[PDB]
Protein: Beta-galactosidase BgaB
Organism: Bifidobacterium adolescentis
Amino acid sequence: AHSDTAILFSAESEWATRSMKLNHWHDVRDWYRAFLDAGSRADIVPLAYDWSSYKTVVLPTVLILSAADTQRLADFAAAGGRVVVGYATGLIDEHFHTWLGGYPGAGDGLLRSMLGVRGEEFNILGPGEIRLSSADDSAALDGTTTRLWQNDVNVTGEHAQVLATYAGEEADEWELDGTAAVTRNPYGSGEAYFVGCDLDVADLTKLVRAYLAAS
Amino acid sequence: AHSDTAILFSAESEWATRSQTLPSMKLNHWHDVRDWYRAFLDAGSRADIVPLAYDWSSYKTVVLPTVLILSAADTQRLADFAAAGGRVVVGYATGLIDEHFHTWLGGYPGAGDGLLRSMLGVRGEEFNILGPGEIRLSSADDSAALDGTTTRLWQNDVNVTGEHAQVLATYAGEEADEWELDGTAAVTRNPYGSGEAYFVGCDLDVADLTKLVRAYLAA
């Protein structure tokens, strides 16, 4: 049906570079010529389209890269796909704000971690006590309490599942009603749990038995 | 012949615990380790306590309770461990300070300049508890594929961090020395889950770019 390689075209990146040594469409065009002369002709596919069935995706000077699209690349790679990232990819988010932190900055470090490389910058030279409630249908952490918790927690991962939240009258007094307390997130082929509060051994055992035990 | 779960112990984090300089005296690394140990024991799945510096790559799950001090290299070890299929459990007070005892900047949790946040899929703003002109390339492998290729647009700031990341080409030659780039990574690839991620740090013309595709990205 289609080729094994997709060269992703971003209309937003073309709009951004068309307004100085960067040119998204010219970079896509050269990568297309390269794959053509190499005998493995590639397709040109819009970034927003479903390219999950391709074996390789190429992102040449895709300047604008959202966290949602960075997650799609990570999912694509983790499931066995091959991702090729140019030097000028993932520098700015979808709201035209520069990705802070190390280079490349797309996804608050998710793209950087996929590549296994890091640069410092893009540089081209020439309430007292709170009760918890299980968010899933397990009721394992219901009735548990905490006396020291992290207050500023935002669930940002697309595939991050909330396992428990702070609830009750005491939780609402600090504007923490519904705030995430225990979460888990897929990362590559693995997983990462976040425990946002202190728990006694009794409550920890219920957390371990419900999610981390061998049984 | 050990357990599936390892609770990591950081001596430096215990030192920061003893300093009594944290926002709460309840922050205690070793006491958090003991509580997690008894929790895993009481649940019928006893976990081992392994020093952070040791090789825990053979475990299936790794737990970091109040590991306040996390270097960039250790955060990278967790990312490599997790991206290959491992499970990582991160406590609320883990990864706040780097190995030089400086607060990690850029958000919460700050370890890895977003690497820990990316793994966890969770971000906070802060810890807050209540209660020349042309350069040649040289192939870093033995394929000698990208040898003789040049570039007039390159990224100077590139450093390889992943344990399994492989450099495929570097900048070499007299012109690369003037930019202090003799040895800097130009083309790398890194395994991520079941797949792969390449980084192309310089602009190549169609002729040289065809060499790259045919060597690594062709059928």
Notes: Chain A touches chain B through 97 residues (CB under 8 Å). Helices of chain A lie at 11-17, 24-37, 67-78, 110-115, 169-173, 201-212.
